[PDB]
Amino acid sequence: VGGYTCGANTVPYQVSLNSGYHFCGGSLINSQWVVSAAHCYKSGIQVRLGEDNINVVEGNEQFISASKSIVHPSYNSNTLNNDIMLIKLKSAASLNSRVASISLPTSCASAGTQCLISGWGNTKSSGTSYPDVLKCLKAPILSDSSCKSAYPGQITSNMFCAGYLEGGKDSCQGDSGGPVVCSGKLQGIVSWGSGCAQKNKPGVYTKVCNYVSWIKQTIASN
Template identity: 40%
Template sequence: MWVQILLLLPMAFLLPPGAWAGEIIGGWEAKPHSRPYMAHLKIQRRGKSYVCGGFLVSENFVLTAAHCNGDNITVYLGAHNIQQWEWSQQKISVRRQIPHPQYKRETLNNDIMLLQLAKRAKLKREVGTIALPRANEIVKPGTWCSVAGWGRTSTESESTSATLREVTVMVMLDAKCPKDPYGPYDNYNPSTMMCVGDPAQGKDSSKGDSGGPLVCRKTAQGIVSWGPPTPPGVYTRVSTFIPWIRATMRRLQP
């Protein structure tokens, strides 16, 4: 399988054979704190450190990709520059990781996970939640959305961005991620995944950006998941999982 996990490095123990990772390509630095829902995840697993993105959906829950799991996760909210102290930042440990029960590591199907925070986030201008879509809501192909993260900015460099970067990307037809057994999208599932990013634009998300939101009209419609080295990339379709998200949050609320 030729896939590009949009996560962190080094992370071979998490990936299917031959998996790739990538970066925000063709983007720009975001206005500081213009995306108050963004979460930066620091992950410990088997003695190694990794990073992912995520987004705040309530005072004590962050949504991210299931492949961003680990032995221990710390969430940073209100961050712009993750390499320096900022008065706006809130550092909160994760009490519980809840990956979707049908998550498949081999195919990255159902690549979605809720993180229950150890304490409630303090909501203010720099820290806020983002709206979720209606259950089974469909984003029309041709819609322009945005994605942001602290991942790599070039395929030629392993360095990641200290500051939050963003890029606009187009939602594509599912047919643009064809299930060809000899191609990079063999595991694409249109009921749980979105095909995003016009190859002609060359803009994409990736390494270090996994788990971050695909935002369409101020709503988190997708989650950065996987894809080949060039767009389109594959995002988890959030609207498919709204019943599970709502039920899980209700069950775990103190």
């Protein structure tokens, strides 16, 4: 896995989901909701906002319990199709410079476009920071071909790939459910893959522009 140390609080809509330790990432959608992967679903979530070193209290955090989890109704855990969940917060977050929502898309993104991918630990440890500090990596949306060819028979409509066609770039763990953001919109969710620094295996992401109406409705229904 590649990318670097992001900068404490440079990705204000990043969340940590903690069940007594960090187990998945997510994104603040509005002061009462988060989105993350379905794969990440579990009972007993605490949502940590404003983190950087998840192992230290450094002053900015907000810890809020989740009060409700909605996994997408046609989520399939064998193929990971529709891998997204909404998390409603027991309380509202106060938003301020370090803790901020991120906007949903109006449009889907174009291959070629360059995004930010945020999250803790791949797994590694020492590149620069900490499995402990938030890390970042920038990488382009790939073509569908490229993606499909990378994983034949597995990619659906609700996915895209991104990164580098090899020795190009891969995250690794701890990062399921975290954001992929391109020109200021949440266009992705970290979902699976089988790469990081393996070969030319991209990651695969849940294609958020697909699920905008679900999210808005649901959220407003809950």
